Amino acid sequence: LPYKVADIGLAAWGRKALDIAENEMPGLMRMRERYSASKPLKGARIAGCLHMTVETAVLIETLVTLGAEVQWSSCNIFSTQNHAAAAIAKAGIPVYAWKGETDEEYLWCIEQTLYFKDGPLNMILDDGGDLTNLIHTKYPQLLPGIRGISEETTTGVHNLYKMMANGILKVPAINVNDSVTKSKFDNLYGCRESLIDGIKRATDVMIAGKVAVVAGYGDVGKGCAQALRGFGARVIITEIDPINALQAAMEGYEVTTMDEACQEGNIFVTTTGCIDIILGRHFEQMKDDAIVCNIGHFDVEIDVKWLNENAVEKVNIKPQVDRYRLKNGRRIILLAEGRLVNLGCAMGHPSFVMSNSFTNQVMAQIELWTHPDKYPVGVHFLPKKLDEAVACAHLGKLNVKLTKLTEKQAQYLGMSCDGPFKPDHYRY
Amino acid sequence: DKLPYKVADIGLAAWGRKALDIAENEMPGLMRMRERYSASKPLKGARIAGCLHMTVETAVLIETLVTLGAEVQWSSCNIFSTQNHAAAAIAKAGIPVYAWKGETDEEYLWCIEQTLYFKDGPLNMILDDGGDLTNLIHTKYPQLLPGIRGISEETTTGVHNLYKMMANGILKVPAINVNDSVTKSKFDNLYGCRESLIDGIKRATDVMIAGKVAVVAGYGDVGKGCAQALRGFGARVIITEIDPINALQAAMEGYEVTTMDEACQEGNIFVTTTGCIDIILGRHFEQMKDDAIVCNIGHFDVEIDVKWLNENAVEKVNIKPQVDRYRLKNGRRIILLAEGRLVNLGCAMGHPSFVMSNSFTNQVMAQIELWTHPDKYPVGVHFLPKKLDEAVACAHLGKLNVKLTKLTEKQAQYLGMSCDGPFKPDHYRY
Amino acid sequence: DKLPYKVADIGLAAWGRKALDIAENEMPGLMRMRERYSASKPLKGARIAGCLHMTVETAVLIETLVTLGAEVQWSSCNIFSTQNHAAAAIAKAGIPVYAWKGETDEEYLWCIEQTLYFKDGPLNMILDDGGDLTNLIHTKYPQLLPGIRGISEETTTGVHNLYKMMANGILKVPAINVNDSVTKSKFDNLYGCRESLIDGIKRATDVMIAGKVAVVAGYGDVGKGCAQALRGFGARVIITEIDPINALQAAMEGYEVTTMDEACQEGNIFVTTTGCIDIILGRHFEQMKDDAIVCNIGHFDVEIDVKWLNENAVEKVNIKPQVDRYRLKNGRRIILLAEGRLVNLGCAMGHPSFVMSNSFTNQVMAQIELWTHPDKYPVGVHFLPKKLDEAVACAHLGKLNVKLTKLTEKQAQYLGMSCDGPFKPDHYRY
Amino acid sequence: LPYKVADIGLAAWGRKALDIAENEMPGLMRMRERYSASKPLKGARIAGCLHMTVETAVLIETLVTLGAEVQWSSCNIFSTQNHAAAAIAKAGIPVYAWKGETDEEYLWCIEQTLYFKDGPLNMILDDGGDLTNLIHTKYPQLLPGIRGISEETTTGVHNLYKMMANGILKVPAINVNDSVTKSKFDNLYGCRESLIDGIKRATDVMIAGKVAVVAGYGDVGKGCAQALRGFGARVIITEIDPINALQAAMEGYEVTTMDEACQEGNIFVTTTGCIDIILGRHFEQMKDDAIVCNIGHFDVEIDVKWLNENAVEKVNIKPQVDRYRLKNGRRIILLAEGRLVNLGCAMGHPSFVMSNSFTNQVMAQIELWTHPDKYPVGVHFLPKKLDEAVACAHLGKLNVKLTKLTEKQAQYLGMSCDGPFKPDHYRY
Ligand SMILES: NC(=O)c1ccc[n+]([C@@H]2O[C@H](COP(=O)([O-])OP(=O)(O)OC[C@H]3O[C@@H](n4cnc5c(N)ncnc54)[C@H](O)[C@@H]3O)[C@@H](O)[C@H]2O)c1
Ligand SMILES: NC(=O)c1ccc[n+]([C@@H]2O[C@H](COP(=O)([O-])OP(=O)(O)OC[C@H]3O[C@@H](n4cnc5c(N)ncnc54)[C@H](O)[C@@H]3O)[C@@H](O)[C@H]2O)c1
Ligand SMILES: NC(=O)c1ccc[n+]([C@@H]2O[C@H](COP(=O)([O-])OP(=O)(O)OC[C@H]3O[C@@H](n4cnc5c(N)ncnc54)[C@H](O)[C@@H]3O)[C@@H](O)[C@H]2O)c1
Ligand SMILES: NC(=O)c1ccc[n+]([C@@H]2O[C@H](COP(=O)([O-])OP(=O)(O)OC[C@H]3O[C@@H](n4cnc5c(N)ncnc54)[C@H](O)[C@@H]3O)[C@@H](O)[C@H]2O)c1
Ligand SMILES: Nc1ncnc2c1ncn2[C@@H]1O[C@H](CO)[C@@H](O)[C@H]1O
Ligand SMILES: Nc1ncnc2c1ncn2[C@@H]1O[C@H](CO)[C@@H](O)[C@H]1O
Ligand SMILES: Nc1ncnc2c1ncn2[C@@H]1O[C@H](CO)[C@@H](O)[C@H]1O
Ligand SMILES: Nc1ncnc2c1ncn2[C@@H]1O[C@H](CO)[C@@H](O)[C@H]1O
């Protein structure tokens, strides 16, 4: 099996989108500009498990430009973009993903990505840690072969920390999420644009005048709240951390609990990465045609199982859009069956912010393969100078003119002018 | 002989019907209208030909006119703005509709003409958007004019035309400026666009707004929404304008305000909203950055010089329907959206149904006003009473769960004002 | 006999003069007016009595009327709104002014009366704010009316009164509604308040806005600015309103909109802007949170029941000038600002001079219009032409370095429009 | 000398302001509620060097409620609020500060605060580190007596890091600035309100329609930019860090250099904590009546010395407001003589956000005196649980209803429900 996709006839349209995407991802293009003739990743066979989209396609191709075999699966069962999976398949790269996978077909795709023509994998590129947990639970014999792993998302690094703690994480990993460039842009500015896209494409509902409830006010919650506020929704935040909770209050958001908010929320958006956020007792109290969705990583935040078993009727409006009628006569509109809505009902984050995440990922793959010394078995961060490098590579596109310290100023501040300008603990 | 309708695919009726049901729940203005008039059937004996974007929202409007006892026949007012499943639902209901997404300039005029004659005779009411149907009748069917009781016009361009026609003594039918109803011009035009513009752009291009420079030509009600929407997603918005007052507003709101001659060198994204010709020209295109996105959301596609692109470009690649990517002799590329047609309906579903409920409630009211009170309206261009305007707004407060304050008799008397009638003078600008 | 003036302290003249010089640099509208008319002296032979907040901005306005050849005598229109050093500068220039910060209701009426008679005879022009001077003359000096050529009225309350007077047939002098000039109502009322409200509150209390719940009564132009300003600093704004249209706007903008009966239990901060009586009552006060701040920014102090506080409170402690801290029987405390008078001028310097330049340019123009074109204006309530309105805006574009677009002859002809005359129809609401 | 103030007759008015302030500073009131009968600080003699204002008055009194002698000076020469310094003097607490100090009178005030009735000081409470650097340079014999120090502001902790690095910091210190509760509220939300207050009171200029230039886009720059944006200024950011620079670009701010910005800026606000930000060549290019000011800690960011020597004329408008005329005929309005404008031309930050900083400061003083073991000679942070405690103590006032994890959810997330909910590196 050379690959698996929904349609290879879409590869042509796919190639167009990539050419456009490339122009929006300077960070990744510098890497090609800089490491083409060098091929640092020479020898590496990188098994990837990220959302197979136009943005990821460009990432994959960049990894190859640096000289490395790559096999790919999708980490979510509806995130994949058919034409993007096609253009990568047509380029001679084993990709196993499509938009509409079942749970068995999802697990089946990750398996094809483990063995290459010249032996098993030696690098993981994961998000959420499905490919990490799989190789640790099903194929522990392949763990000594793997040299490094790089994790994209917040749930998958929290899981990589829980593994190192329980002494089961046998391979060294780099936390790419906690790069400032990822967490404080991707999670923040990314969802701020793609949440509403997902919701709009699915429902075409008016945001203005509505009351929107956002569970969680971390980086993702912040972006979602800001977005809905932008279109003149009234936003209500729920939260368990007093610091995050206070941040939201100081921004003019009412902060209460779901038990209260469910009685006035028109729109619901879980962003906690936690279970049991919206339950049946919430559903029973919601206004008619309340719109419920999730933008956390796993579909564990909404009790969809309750809606199935307790709804009077379930009308499907179109793919990833269900309209339940309840025994109280009012209806609930659920999106993407609880799975993340921005990739399930839209095209995910725009290419530019992904260039920031994926530029981090290239460096995270280079470091783990070019300097296997620095990184023992643990959970490490990328050095700030490299984190700043990613930011610097995107300034050009945005036409940003950056100031440079005089020698006198550098001496006053006691820092090297090229040198990272912030201490490690700096929170931006 | 004569077709019953013509649409993309009648199969999409079942799907459209679901959309209609959902939309109905978002459009209290039209539903109250139904609950209030379905028995009295005020529009009985009216034969209304409509030229308006055949969308899900318009479907709900059409079925409301029918419930009010009218006979309706519809065509879209833009070749790209029809939503096929919405047309299927209406067609399957038994309503003569002539609209599909992707019409030729030829087919578009054909579609309108299929509406002009009903089984019970010719049209006697006009529900127009942009003035296309108004102009068509006044020009190719002037003999039909005396049998038309009135016109209601939806958008700014259309009513401008009407006023011009009135000033040149060529308008022969009395008309109602529905656009300049407060519940239309200050909500539909402003808030509607504020949400639908971004959506049009996203669907078409999937581009990051944050960090982009955006150029909005025009700062009327439409431009205000667009600027607001763009800046919300982290773009630095630049504005162009000919009205010094509008210009002052934009500056006071923190927007840089300059000329297109200047902005074309800065913009990553360009949005025309002026309703005027020749806003973006070849000289502008030649200075734009690589992969600049260019789109219009004014009523007619006369604001961007597309024919220049076609003639002077060295490459033209269709990325997908209504998304073309040109390359110019300088090697930099220009993304055009919907062949210069309005991008919110061209590349997306237009305004959300809730704000359209305001637009369309005003429409229904104007149709009742013209049909049943002809004597109120002599040949001219008229506004709805402020009372009916305020009534529209009041109809949408419930769904948003707004709680309105009531004047005490003292408060009212102090203000010299009815507790229940225009809380504002005519010239009030909200 | 008759004093030349009366002000707090003539010593503050030197200081005020500096402020005047700075202000002049921020008010191009008035300066262009000077450069344009100082030689022609259009207002020669005019004897203008003014009742308007004696601030730095007004000083600049006064000296502009003098440069235009007029004889001016001034009193403030609010007992708390005068800025002493601004009054000193005017007094020292030789202009009869009667104003100081901290006037009694008695002294305030006295101050106005000192303006009614000039050395060269009685007043023949009125420049009023709120209608106090208009009503005074029509009531206690009706014999003076026939020798008055016209009136210009600055604020919403004042023009409402004028229209009422016109509808009851008791207005005997022709007047110009300056408030409903676009360059006033959409800038002064909106943007002016957006900056000066917060400043009034800060100076008075130095309280954190972020994290507070704020209740704004009224969502007209003034309320819109206040809501905007408060939400900007991280307050959750709640709105009350009687006009369903205004209410819809507020909701569409993301504000919760309910009744004062409800809000009084939530608010940390309360801001009245309705221009109506009895907005906040004892029943409201009794439910407010501890140390709730309460203030008004409408024209008259009739919106808050201060006398209730005085009579029913168990404690009253003056914290500092125009800041009183009550305690109620429930043990919770209420902070009142400026005895319920408008808080932006009461506890701060009012609007910044730049936006006031728009208000005051319209004023100067109205005075020239009434003085030199009486025949244009018969007894009634009139608007300035849109042309002059647009001219005001154009005068302030330069300082902000705005670059305005010019129509091509084709573009204009397409739009059926002068390149240089009202770019909008009358009913346009901007 | 029992104290030194501008007027003790203002103590009455001062007491009123405190009673009001107290109601806005719940965080500090809980500390009194909790440690009055306990007097943990019993034995401590705390020499303070913070801005002597209404907010600080409440802090001082809280420290005393916990049973500790306190002497106080002001760290800036125009920040002090007379009536607040009066109410503390009248309460029997040696305070040496007033609004209008000279440089010699400033140094003179810090000296009185060193020796108490029962011996020299044993605790520092500094900001900027003037009292820290003084005792290290002038009175090193008193260093062994001092048990702990707590630093408030960003410049004073960067200086405390430079001292520990050069092995000259002989006493253990707690970094209070880098508490999330301080840096991500005080610096951020505080200046967002008090910058414009300072500018308004000084000039009464219209913000709308103006172009404002903000040097720096850290926590302070972020607040200042957001504020000016709020009133419809067009804001331009200058910056040396690509990450901070990119953040500003993704928020819709034009990011260029001062060399460009000076030619269109109507208003100028330095927030870098760095020298030589605005020089004569910038001044020469500025528009007429450009308004220049600074909200960084030291008055080193603006070249006022240049304006004095090169201006044609210098008209004083009122205190802390100069209007220079230049040889090009255009004028510059300088505020507070370059010193920080929010405390020099207004009343500083509102009491509520200060309650967050000062609640941190109490815990920082308790920890250094109650548990002298945990903190050796270095630069330490407060533990996240205490940082979250500060946030929690303010939720009540704001009417925030916080969610609590179920046992099931806590187990899913693998965290204690009371337990800090974020990893150390979390950036909020
Ligand atoms: N859809 C996307 O494209 C996308 C992008 C980035 C991250 N994510 C996912 O989003 C989720 C969160 O990402 P984050 O970076 O926002 O994490 P984060 O930890 O910054 O914020 C999560 C917030 O949820 C709060 N929370 C936890 N349980 C809660 C509860 N029961 N009620 C209310 N609030 C609660 C936490 O206090 C925290 O502040 C993760 O699953 C992450 O993988 C998705
Ligand atoms: N796509 C939609 O859904 C939608 C919705 C509402 C209105 N519209 C259309 O949008 C257009 C404008 O709507 P509006 O309601 O904003 O009308 P409007 O007249 O308020 O806006 C016109 C603005 O354009 C400015 N303008 C005119 N010529 C200009 C030029 N050459 N350069 C710069 N600015 C110029 C005018 O001065 C004015 O400020 C009309 O064609 C109207 O039909 C479209
Ligand atoms: N302080 C200042 O510098 C300043 C500046 C401009 C105007 N004003 C004064 O402010 C007041 C309003 O100015 P505006 O221009 O906003 O006029 P406006 O008439 O647009 O605002 C009136 C708003 O108040 C609403 N309203 C009336 N009674 C109400 C009630 N009982 N409860 C709630 N809402 C109610 C009206 O429906 C309307 O929305 C007037 O007194 C005007 O003179 C003061
Ligand atoms: N006035 C107040 O009440 C108050 C409150 C908090 C902090 N501060 C002071 O403000 C200053 C900064 O505080 P911060 O917390 O904002 O620090 P911060 O480090 O978060 O942000 C400072 C920014 O300045 C940038 N910078 C440095 N040199 C620059 C240059 N030459 N040009 C442009 N940008 C440059 C840095 O990159 C950094 O992002 C310090 O002096 C601090 O003490 C004052
Ligand atoms: N368009 C996209 N392509 C690939 N990954 C994406 C896209 N949009 C969001 N993500 C990533 O999905 C993860 C959520 O599982 C986040 O780490 C986020 O960076
Ligand atoms: N979804 C929609 N259905 C019908 N008309 C619409 C829709 N969205 C915008 N419009 C109308 O399109 C016109 C622009 O040509 C405006 O008058 C506006 O009201
Ligand atoms: N600084 C000021 N000088 C004079 N009038 C002002 C000032 N600020 C606000 N006003 C006016 O006060 C009136 C409210 O009574 C409004 O008409 C407004 O224009
Ligand atoms: N009103 C105030 N009282 C005391 N300290 C303040 C006040 N406003 C700001 N600060 C502090 O001043 C420091 C700047 O030198 C910052 O650490 C900030 O927390």
PDB file of C-alpha atoms in Angstrom, chain B residues 124-252:
ATOM      1  CA  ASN B 124     -49.004  44.567 -10.153  1.00  0.00           C
ATOM      2  CA  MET B 125     -46.321  44.833  -7.446  1.00  0.00           C
ATOM      3  CA  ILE B 126     -42.532  45.053  -7.550  1.00  0.00           C
ATOM      4  CA  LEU B 127     -40.094  43.909  -4.893  1.00  0.00           C
ATOM      5  CA  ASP B 128     -36.745  44.998  -6.305  1.00  0.00           C
ATOM      6  CA  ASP B 129     -33.079  45.024  -5.238  1.00  0.00           C
ATOM      7  CA  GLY B 130     -30.739  47.348  -7.132  1.00  0.00           C
ATOM      8  CA  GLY B 131     -33.391  48.613  -9.524  1.00  0.00           C
ATOM      9  CA  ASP B 132     -32.801  46.077 -12.294  1.00  0.00           C
ATOM     10  CA  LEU B 133     -36.440  45.018 -12.393  1.00  0.00           C
ATOM     11  CA  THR B 134     -37.592  48.636 -12.023  1.00  0.00           C
ATOM     12  CA  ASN B 135     -35.468  49.757 -14.956  1.00  0.00           C
ATOM     13  CA  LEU B 136     -36.376  46.732 -17.077  1.00  0.00           C
ATOM     14  CA  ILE B 137     -40.102  47.451 -16.822  1.00  0.00           C
ATOM     15  CA  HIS B 138     -39.774  51.234 -17.304  1.00  0.00           C
ATOM     16  CA  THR B 139     -37.762  50.524 -20.489  1.00  0.00           C
ATOM     17  CA  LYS B 140     -38.833  47.307 -22.260  1.00  0.00           C
ATOM     18  CA  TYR B 141     -42.357  47.077 -20.814  1.00  0.00           C
ATOM     19  CA  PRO B 142     -43.529  50.652 -20.175  1.00  0.00           C
ATOM     20  CA  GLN B 143     -47.033  49.552 -21.196  1.00  0.00           C
ATOM     21  CA  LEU B 144     -47.074  47.415 -18.038  1.00  0.00           C
ATOM     22  CA  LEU B 145     -46.425  50.346 -15.694  1.00  0.00           C
ATOM     23  CA  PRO B 146     -50.021  51.629 -15.216  1.00  0.00           C
ATOM     24  CA  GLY B 147     -51.039  48.231 -13.812  1.00  0.00           C
ATOM     25  CA  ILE B 148     -48.333  48.336 -11.135  1.00  0.00           C
ATOM     26  CA  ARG B 149     -49.475  49.669  -7.781  1.00  0.00           C
ATOM     27  CA  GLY B 150     -46.031  50.171  -6.270  1.00  0.00           C
ATOM     28  CA  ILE B 151     -42.360  49.363  -5.762  1.00  0.00           C
ATOM     29  CA  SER B 152     -40.204  48.596  -2.730  1.00  0.00           C
ATOM     30  CA  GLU B 153     -36.421  48.861  -3.160  1.00  0.00           C
ATOM     31  CA  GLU B 154     -34.016  47.071  -0.872  1.00  0.00           C
ATOM     32  CA  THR B 155     -30.509  48.520  -1.286  1.00  0.00           C
ATOM     33  CA  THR B 156     -28.675  51.871  -1.423  1.00  0.00           C
ATOM     34  CA  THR B 157     -27.821  51.716  -5.123  1.00  0.00           C
ATOM     35  CA  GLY B 158     -31.405  50.964  -6.051  1.00  0.00           C
ATOM     36  CA  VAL B 159     -32.918  53.900  -4.182  1.00  0.00           C
ATOM     37  CA  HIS B 160     -30.260  56.245  -5.553  1.00  0.00           C
ATOM     38  CA  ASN B 161     -31.423  55.234  -9.019  1.00  0.00           C
ATOM     39  CA  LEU B 162     -35.041  55.798  -7.985  1.00  0.00           C
ATOM     40  CA  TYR B 163     -34.328  59.345  -6.783  1.00  0.00           C
ATOM     41  CA  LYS B 164     -32.474  60.083 -10.017  1.00  0.00           C
ATOM     42  CA  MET B 165     -35.430  58.733 -12.012  1.00  0.00           C
ATOM     43  CA  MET B 166     -37.735  60.934  -9.945  1.00  0.00           C
ATOM     44  CA  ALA B 167     -35.580  64.010 -10.548  1.00  0.00           C
ATOM     45  CA  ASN B 168     -35.637  63.395 -14.326  1.00  0.00           C
ATOM     46  CA  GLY B 169     -39.397  62.809 -14.348  1.00  0.00           C
ATOM     47  CA  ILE B 170     -39.163  59.237 -15.655  1.00  0.00           C
ATOM     48  CA  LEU B 171     -40.453  57.271 -12.640  1.00  0.00           C
ATOM     49  CA  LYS B 172     -44.124  56.431 -13.201  1.00  0.00           C
ATOM     50  CA  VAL B 173     -44.781  54.135 -10.236  1.00  0.00           C
ATOM     51  CA  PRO B 174     -44.779  55.158  -6.561  1.00  0.00           C
ATOM     52  CA  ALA B 175     -41.952  53.544  -4.586  1.00  0.00           C
ATOM     53  CA  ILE B 176     -40.869  52.985  -0.971  1.00  0.00           C
ATOM     54  CA  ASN B 177     -37.265  53.515   0.013  1.00  0.00           C
ATOM     55  CA  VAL B 178     -36.875  50.481   2.284  1.00  0.00           C
ATOM     56  CA  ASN B 179     -33.083  50.795   2.430  1.00  0.00           C
ATOM     57  CA  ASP B 180     -33.242  54.027   4.389  1.00  0.00           C
ATOM     58  CA  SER B 181     -35.499  52.487   6.983  1.00  0.00           C
ATOM     59  CA  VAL B 182     -33.421  52.647  10.155  1.00  0.00           C
ATOM     60  CA  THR B 183     -33.917  48.957  10.838  1.00  0.00           C
ATOM     61  CA  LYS B 184     -32.347  48.247   7.464  1.00  0.00           C
ATOM     62  CA  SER B 185     -29.551  50.766   6.800  1.00  0.00           C
ATOM     63  CA  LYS B 186     -28.161  50.652  10.352  1.00  0.00           C
ATOM     64  CA  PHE B 187     -28.356  46.893  10.842  1.00  0.00           C
ATOM     65  CA  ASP B 188     -28.363  44.997   7.561  1.00  0.00           C
ATOM     66  CA  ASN B 189     -25.801  47.221   5.872  1.00  0.00           C
ATOM     67  CA  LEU B 190     -23.658  47.603   9.022  1.00  0.00           C
ATOM     68  CA  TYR B 191     -23.894  44.431  11.126  1.00  0.00           C
ATOM     69  CA  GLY B 192     -24.800  42.125   8.264  1.00  0.00           C
ATOM     70  CA  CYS B 193     -21.661  42.933   6.305  1.00  0.00           C
ATOM     71  CA  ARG B 194     -19.578  42.919   9.486  1.00  0.00           C
ATOM     72  CA  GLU B 195     -20.120  39.142   9.629  1.00  0.00           C
ATOM     73  CA  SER B 196     -20.623  38.084   6.018  1.00  0.00           C
ATOM     74  CA  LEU B 197     -17.612  39.849   4.431  1.00  0.00           C
ATOM     75  CA  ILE B 198     -15.068  37.893   6.455  1.00  0.00           C
ATOM     76  CA  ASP B 199     -16.987  34.724   5.735  1.00  0.00           C
ATOM     77  CA  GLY B 200     -16.919  35.347   1.993  1.00  0.00           C
ATOM     78  CA  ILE B 201     -13.172  35.929   2.121  1.00  0.00           C
ATOM     79  CA  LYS B 202     -12.478  32.918   4.322  1.00  0.00           C
ATOM     80  CA  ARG B 203     -14.407  30.460   2.214  1.00  0.00           C
ATOM     81  CA  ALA B 204     -12.722  31.808  -0.891  1.00  0.00           C
ATOM     82  CA  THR B 205      -9.117  31.956   0.319  1.00  0.00           C
ATOM     83  CA  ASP B 206      -8.703  30.676   3.886  1.00  0.00           C
ATOM     84  CA  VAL B 207      -6.208  33.434   4.539  1.00  0.00           C
ATOM     85  CA  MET B 208      -4.968  34.782   7.884  1.00  0.00           C
ATOM     86  CA  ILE B 209      -6.492  38.224   8.489  1.00  0.00           C
ATOM     87  CA  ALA B 210      -4.343  38.960  11.537  1.00  0.00           C
ATOM     88  CA  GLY B 211      -1.204  40.862  10.569  1.00  0.00           C
ATOM     89  CA  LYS B 212      -2.522  41.869   7.157  1.00  0.00           C
ATOM     90  CA  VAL B 213      -2.979  45.437   5.970  1.00  0.00           C
ATOM     91  CA  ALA B 214      -6.532  45.912   4.721  1.00  0.00           C
ATOM     92  CA  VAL B 215      -7.855  48.674   2.490  1.00  0.00           C
ATOM     93  CA  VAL B 216     -11.551  49.495   2.603  1.00  0.00           C
ATOM     94  CA  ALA B 217     -12.801  51.961   0.019  1.00  0.00           C
ATOM     95  CA  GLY B 218     -15.845  53.798   1.317  1.00  0.00           C
ATOM     96  CA  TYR B 219     -16.872  54.396   4.920  1.00  0.00           C
ATOM     97  CA  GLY B 220     -20.643  54.531   4.618  1.00  0.00           C
ATOM     98  CA  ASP B 221     -22.683  51.983   6.529  1.00  0.00           C
ATOM     99  CA  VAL B 222     -21.294  49.018   4.594  1.00  0.00           C
ATOM    100  CA  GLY B 223     -17.682  50.160   4.881  1.00  0.00           C
ATOM    101  CA  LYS B 224     -18.057  50.757   8.620  1.00  0.00           C
ATOM    102  CA  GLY B 225     -19.037  47.121   9.167  1.00  0.00           C
ATOM    103  CA  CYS B 226     -16.210  45.820   7.004  1.00  0.00           C
ATOM    104  CA  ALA B 227     -13.559  47.973   8.624  1.00  0.00           C
ATOM    105  CA  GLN B 228     -14.852  46.873  12.011  1.00  0.00           C
ATOM    106  CA  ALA B 229     -14.845  43.206  11.047  1.00  0.00           C
ATOM    107  CA  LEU B 230     -11.341  43.300   9.569  1.00  0.00           C
ATOM    108  CA  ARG B 231      -9.802  45.195  12.462  1.00  0.00           C
ATOM    109  CA  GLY B 232     -11.432  42.726  14.832  1.00  0.00           C
ATOM    110  CA  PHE B 233      -9.413  39.880  13.346  1.00  0.00           C
ATOM    111  CA  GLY B 234      -6.198  41.848  13.764  1.00  0.00           C
ATOM    112  CA  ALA B 235      -5.777  43.637  10.457  1.00  0.00           C
ATOM    113  CA  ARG B 236      -4.583  47.220  10.222  1.00  0.00           C
ATOM    114  CA  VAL B 237      -7.386  48.866   8.271  1.00  0.00           C
ATOM    115  CA  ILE B 238      -6.848  51.785   5.900  1.00  0.00           C
ATOM    116  CA  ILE B 239      -9.769  53.809   4.537  1.00  0.00           C
ATOM    117  CA  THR B 240     -10.446  55.917   1.451  1.00  0.00           C
ATOM    118  CA  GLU B 241     -13.367  58.294   1.122  1.00  0.00           C
ATOM    119  CA  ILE B 242     -14.767  61.317  -0.723  1.00  0.00           C
ATOM    120  CA  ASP B 243     -17.147  62.574   1.984  1.00  0.00           C
ATOM    121  CA  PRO B 244     -15.151  64.602   4.525  1.00  0.00           C
ATOM    122  CA  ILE B 245     -17.658  63.744   7.247  1.00  0.00           C
ATOM    123  CA  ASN B 246     -17.335  59.981   6.741  1.00  0.00           C
ATOM    124  CA  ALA B 247     -13.598  60.508   6.559  1.00  0.00           C
ATOM    125  CA  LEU B 248     -13.572  62.319   9.870  1.00  0.00           C
ATOM    126  CA  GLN B 249     -15.487  59.450  11.472  1.00  0.00           C
ATOM    127  CA  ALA B 250     -12.911  56.901  10.273  1.00  0.00           C
ATOM    128  CA  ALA B 251     -10.000  58.939  11.606  1.00  0.00           C
ATOM    129  CA  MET B 252     -11.737  59.535  14.930  1.00  0.00           C
TER     130      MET B 252
END
